[PDB]
Amino acid sequence: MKLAPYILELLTSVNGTADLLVPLLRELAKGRPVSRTTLAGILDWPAERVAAVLEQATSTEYDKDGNIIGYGLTLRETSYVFEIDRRLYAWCALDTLIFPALIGRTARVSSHCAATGAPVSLTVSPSEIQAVEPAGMAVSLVLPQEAADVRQSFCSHVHFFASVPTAEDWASKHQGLEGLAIVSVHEAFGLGQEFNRHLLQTMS
Ligand SMILES: [Hg+2]
C-alpha cells in the first residue's frame, strides 16, 4: 500500500525529457501530428536535442510523414479513451489520471474493465476525479522496468477494473508481473499527483 516505489521508477524510465514532455502533450492535445521542427520551435531547442530525447523513447508513435502522433497521449486508438470535442487516446489507465494536470484541461475518460469488459468512465481534472462509474473502480500497477520498452513493460499492464475485488481476482492469475498491485482509482490519482509534483520540480 506504499506507492513511492512506483513513483520513483516511473520517473526513472520516463525521465531534458521532462522539459519536452509537457510541451509535447499539450501539442498532441490539439488533435494533430507534431513535427520535430515544430516541437523544437516550441522548446527553443536545436533539432538534434529533440531527436536525441525522442530516440530514448522507444514506444514513440509516428505517422506516415514521421511526425509524432503518440507519446503517452496518442491519436491512434487504444482501450483508453481520452476526450477533451476531440477524441484522443492514452497508452494506459494511469496516463489518463496524470495528463489532465499537465495539460491544464479536464478530460472525459472511458474504457472497459480488463477482467470483465464492463464499461467504466470518469471525469479527470487537474485536481480531482469525479463521476467515477462504477464508484469502486480500480487500477492495476506494475513496477516500471528501467531500460525496457515502457509501453510493453508498464503501460500494457496498467488497466481499469470495475471493482477492487474483481481486480484482485484478476491479479491472482497474473504472476510474472513485477510488483503487480491493485489500488482504488482514487489512490491511483493520488499517485499521479505525486508523480506530477516531482516531475515539475525536475523541469527547467
Ligand atoms: Hg503508461
CA of 26 to the centre of ligand 1 (A): 17
- Alpha-carbon distance 131 to 110, whole Å? 11
Give whole-number Cα distances, 19 to 24, 80, 122, in Å.
9, 25, 29
Please choose, from the candidates 140, 137, 68, 151, the residue with its C-alpha nearest in 3D space to the C-alpha of residue 109: 137
Phi-psi region of 182 (alpha: psi -120 to 50; beta: other; left: phi over 0): beta
Rounded distance, CA 144 to CA 159, Å? Answer: 14
CA dist., res. 40 & res. 71, Å (int)? 16
Q: What is the largest CA-CA distance in the chain?
A: 50
64/110 Cα distance (integer angstroms): 28
Spacing, Cα 100 to ligand 1 middle (Å): 14
Q: Determine whether domain 1-204 maps to CATH 3.30.450.410.
A: yes
Residue with cell 486508438: 77
Amino acid at 90: A
44, 63, 92, 113: the active-site residue: 92
Q: Which residues contact 72 (CB under 8 A, 6 or more apart)?
A: 25, 90, 91, 95, 99
Residues 6+ apart with CB under 8 A from 93: 80, 111, 139, 140, 158, 159, 160, 188
Domain boundaries, the chain: 1-204
Residue found under cell 478530460 = 107
Task: Give the technique used to solve this structure.
Answer: X-ray
**CA 113 – CA 26 distance, rounded (Å):** 28
Helix, coil or strand: residue 1: coil
Measuring CA to CA, which residue among 143, 63, 136, 129 is closest to residue 96? 129
144 Cα–ligand 1 center, Å: 9
Q: Which 3 state secondary structure label does DSSP give 176?
A: coil
Q: How much distance in Å is there from the Cα of 162 to the middle of ligand 1?
A: 19
Cell numbers 462504477: residue: 134
CA of 55 from ligand 1 middle (Å) equals 18
Residue among 98, 199, 82 at smallest CA distance from 154:
98
| 155 in active site | yes
User: Which helix (DSSP H) or strand (DSSP E) does residue 68 occupy?
Assistant: strand 68-71
Would you call 95 helix, strand, or coil by DSSP? helix
Is 113 considered catalytic here?
no
- CA atoms of 67 and 64, how far apart (whole Å): 8
Paired residues of 90 in beta bridges: 73, 80
Which stretches within 74-131 are classed as H helix? 93-103
| Residue 175 CB contacts under 8 Å (≥ 6 apart), including other chains | none
- Close Cβ partners of 7 (under 8 Å, ≥ 6 residues apart): 191, 194, 195, 198
Contacts of 81 (CB under 8 A, 6+ apart): 87, 89, 90, 108, 109, 110, 111
Of the residues 19, 44, 65, 95, only one is catalytic, namely: 95
Distance from residue 95's CA to the centre of ligand 1 (Å): 5
